[PDB]
Write a protein that holds these residues in place. Structure first.
Motif, PDB file in Angstrom:
ATOM      1  N   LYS A   1     -15.439  -5.812  -1.469  1.00 38.35           N
ATOM      2  CA  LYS A   1     -14.933  -7.073  -0.908  1.00 38.35           C
ATOM      3  C   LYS A   1     -13.977  -7.756  -1.889  1.00 38.35           C
ATOM      4  N   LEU A   2     -12.701  -8.122  -1.345  1.00 40.08           N
ATOM      5  CA  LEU A   2     -11.712  -8.959  -1.885  1.00 40.08           C
ATOM      6  C   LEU A   2     -11.079  -8.290  -3.088  1.00 40.08           C
ATOM      7  N   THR A   3     -11.178  -7.073  -2.997  1.00 40.33           N
ATOM      8  CA  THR A   3     -10.725  -6.291  -4.407  1.00 40.33           C
ATOM      9  C   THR A   3      -9.610  -5.694  -4.135  1.00 40.33           C
ATOM     10  N   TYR A   4      -8.668  -5.497  -4.923  1.00 46.86           N
ATOM     11  CA  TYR A   4      -7.312  -4.664  -5.032  1.00 46.86           C
ATOM     12  C   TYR A   4      -7.331  -4.022  -6.340  1.00 46.86           C
ATOM     13  N   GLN A   5      -6.102  -3.174  -6.501  1.00 44.64           N
ATOM     14  CA  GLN A   5      -5.988  -2.266  -7.749  1.00 44.64           C
ATOM     15  C   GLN A   5      -4.169  -2.360  -7.778  1.00 44.64           C
ATOM     16  N   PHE A   6      -3.942  -2.650  -9.006  1.00 44.23           N
ATOM     17  CA  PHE A   6      -2.525  -2.538  -9.293  1.00 44.23           C
ATOM     18  C   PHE A   6      -2.253  -0.906  -9.740  1.00 44.23           C
TER      19      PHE A   6
ATOM     20  N   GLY B   1       0.718  -1.402   0.032  1.00 39.18           N
ATOM     21  CA  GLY B   1       0.049   0.045   0.106  1.00 39.18           C
ATOM     22  C   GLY B   1       0.778   1.231   0.037  1.00 39.18           C
ATOM     23  N   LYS B   2       1.947   1.269   0.867  1.00 35.69           N
ATOM     24  CA  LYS B   2       2.806   2.432   0.817  1.00 35.69           C
ATOM     25  C   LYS B   2       3.694   2.654  -0.253  1.00 35.69           C
ATOM     26  N   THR B   3       4.184   1.708  -1.053  1.00 33.60           N
ATOM     27  CA  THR B   3       4.971   1.883  -2.079  1.00 33.60           C
ATOM     28  C   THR B   3       4.237   1.888  -3.495  1.00 33.60           C
ATOM     29  N   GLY B   4       3.035   1.281  -3.281  1.00 32.12           N
ATOM     30  CA  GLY B   4       1.809   1.689  -4.511  1.00 32.12           C
ATOM     31  C   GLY B   4       1.546   0.675  -5.491  1.00 32.12           C
ATOM     32  N   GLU B   5       2.347  -0.540  -5.293  1.00 33.25           N
ATOM     33  CA  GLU B   5       2.237  -1.537  -6.392  1.00 33.25           C
ATOM     34  C   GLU B   5       0.678  -1.864  -6.453  1.00 33.25           C
ATOM     35  N   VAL B   6       0.178  -2.212  -5.374  1.00 36.52           N
ATOM     36  CA  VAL B   6      -1.100  -2.686  -5.126  1.00 36.52           C
ATOM     37  C   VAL B   6      -1.852  -1.794  -4.046  1.00 36.52           C
ATOM     38  N   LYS B   7      -3.056  -1.587  -3.959  1.00 43.82           N
ATOM     39  CA  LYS B   7      -3.550  -0.804  -3.036  1.00 43.82           C
ATOM     40  C   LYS B   7      -4.868  -1.610  -3.043  1.00 43.82           C
ATOM     41  N   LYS B   8      -5.489  -1.627  -1.653  1.00 45.24           N
ATOM     42  CA  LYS B   8      -6.742  -2.285  -1.267  1.00 45.24           C
ATOM     43  C   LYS B   8      -7.890  -1.220  -1.923  1.00 45.24           C
ATOM     44  N   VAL B   9      -9.103  -1.799  -2.496  1.00 49.32           N
ATOM     45  CA  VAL B   9     -10.172  -1.073  -2.954  1.00 49.32           C
ATOM     46  C   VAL B   9     -11.136  -1.425  -1.817  1.00 49.32           C
ATOM     47  N   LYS B  10     -12.085  -0.607  -1.624  1.00 44.94           N
ATOM     48  CA  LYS B  10     -13.162  -0.564  -0.426  1.00 44.94           C
ATOM     49  C   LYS B  10     -14.376  -1.483  -1.188  1.00 44.94           C
TER      50      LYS B  10
END
Ligand code: NA
Length: 91
Positions: A79-84, A68-77
């Motif tokens: 269920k079970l969803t993320y973002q490159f 999350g801090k370096t930014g490669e993948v972030k959690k989306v609000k």
DNA sequence: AATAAGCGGAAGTGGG
DNA sequence: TCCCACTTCCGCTTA
């Protein structure tokens, strides 16, 4: 060895575990894991890495949160969803 | 309660 | 030495 985010991106590109992970909006890089079938994907990650213990979705998501801090993948609000990141998608 | 997702501090492991 | 890139363990929060 391959990094976790690259393992996931490669799976999404190949479609080999399409019942465990899928794009939500591929143009935005959003993706989602299956509630019932994510553990099989976690197991594969641990075996690919040769880790001592069986990998679980909980431990894999613990690693994902560190991006999350370096930014490669972030959690989306969702269920079970993320973002490159765009950088990850471009490479 | 049972089930499930989400969180992160802390310490351990790998391969530089 | 000491950071990389997680892994493992544990206790907690919210729905
Ligand atoms: Na879960």
């Amino acid at each position: 060895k391959i990094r976790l985010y690259q393992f996931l991106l490669d799976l999404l590109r190949s479609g080999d575990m399409k019942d465990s992970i899928w794009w939500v909006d591929k143009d935005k890089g959003t993706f989602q894991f299956s509630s019932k079938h994510k553990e099989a994907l976690a197991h594969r990650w641990g075996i690919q890495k040769g880790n001592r213990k069986k990998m679980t979705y909980q431990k894999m998501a613990r690693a994902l949160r560190n991006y999350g801090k370096t930014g490669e993948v972030k959690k989306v609000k969702k269920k079970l969803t993320y973002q490159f990141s765009g950088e990850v998608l471009g490479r």
